[PDB]
Design a protein around this ligand. Structure first.
Ligand SMILES: Nc1nc2ncc([C@@H](O)[C@H](O)CO)nc2c(=O)[nH]1
Length: 267
């Protein structure tokens, strides 16, 4: 066996409902947050510094309607999708630094074929590759059915990288963004409830883009007040400003670690 098999959380597109999608996202969230380190009620993701590699990754087994499966690697410290495995191959985005390049070797070690892409996995590289921006890519259970198939066929040549980058973007939103924001799990539940496939709107896209910033402002907010107004976007593109963490408590599910557990405050 490898020294600690990282936790795997399974999900299927096969008979999905709002109940099985909520379950899956609760589980994933419950795998990521320390439990403790609750800043003004939001759980903070564990600091990358004193984190042992045998605690670094969560694996998500994405099954499918035609019994094809993909296993994604999730980085606990930010819920980032760092790479994936399909059949006997494993592919990882290009790491952003040496430390990450190092850690990534402890992932799917039993695969025969490992590949590290030339490009990184952030939305900008991926939108350019997909040749289609996030607001023009559809989300919902049918798009996720299509994504898992694409990732699995990349191994046996039904590649086409535009389609593969598009499939990663779809998968990053319905899994890591849904976990980061209670708001975005809500958009996906509606698409699954009505069996809709719709692109994300401005309120959804700006939350994705502002998560780091939100984590820093909530962690350095004085008492509950943001030391300067953060503007978000409405679903119609109107900007508005949030000045206080309470507005965001039903919105953001977890935060990336930025500052010191306060002094304590948990008990
Ligand atoms: N591979 C992969 N790529 C990503 N790119 C951007 C973001 C965003 O959530 C950033 O926080 C801001 O755009 N998340 C991810 C992600 O989890 N996985």
């Amino acid at each position: 066996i490898f020294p600690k098999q990282y936790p795997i959380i399974n999900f299927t597109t096969a008979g999905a409902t709002v109940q099985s999608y909520t379950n899956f996202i609760r589980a994933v969230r419950g795998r990521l947050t320390t439990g403790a380190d609750v800043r003004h009620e939001i759980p903070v993701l564990p600091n990358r510094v004193g984190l042992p590699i045998n605690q670094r990754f969560i694996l998500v087994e994405l099954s499918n309607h035609a019994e094809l499966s993909v296993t994604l690697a999730l980085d606990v410290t930010n819920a980032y999708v760092v790479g994936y495995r399909a059949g006997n191959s494993a592919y990882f985005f290009h790491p952003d630094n040496q430390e990450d390049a190092e850690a990534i070797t402890h992932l799917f070690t039993d695969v025969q074929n490992r590949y590290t892409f030339a490009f990184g996995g952030n939305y900008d590289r991926l939108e350019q590759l997909a040749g289609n921006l996030r607001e023009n890519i559809e989300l919902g259970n049918g798009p996720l059915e299509e994504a898992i198939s694409a990732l699995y066929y990349y191994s046996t040549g039904g590649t086409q990288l535009p389609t593969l980058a598009r499939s990663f973007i779809i998968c990053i939103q319905m899994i890591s963004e849904a976990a980061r924001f209670q708001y975005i799990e809500g958009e996906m539940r509606t698409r699954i409830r009505y069996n809709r496939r719709s692109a994300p709107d401005p309120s959804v896209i700006t939350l994705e883009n502002s998560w780091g910033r939100l984590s820093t402002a909530i962690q350095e907010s004085n008492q509950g007040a943001f030391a300067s107004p953060i503007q978000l976007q409405r679903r119609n593109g109107s900007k508005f400003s949030v000045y206080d963490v309470s507005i965001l408590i039903p919105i953001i599910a977890l935060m990336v670690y930025r500052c010191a557990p306060p002094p304590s405050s948990q008990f």
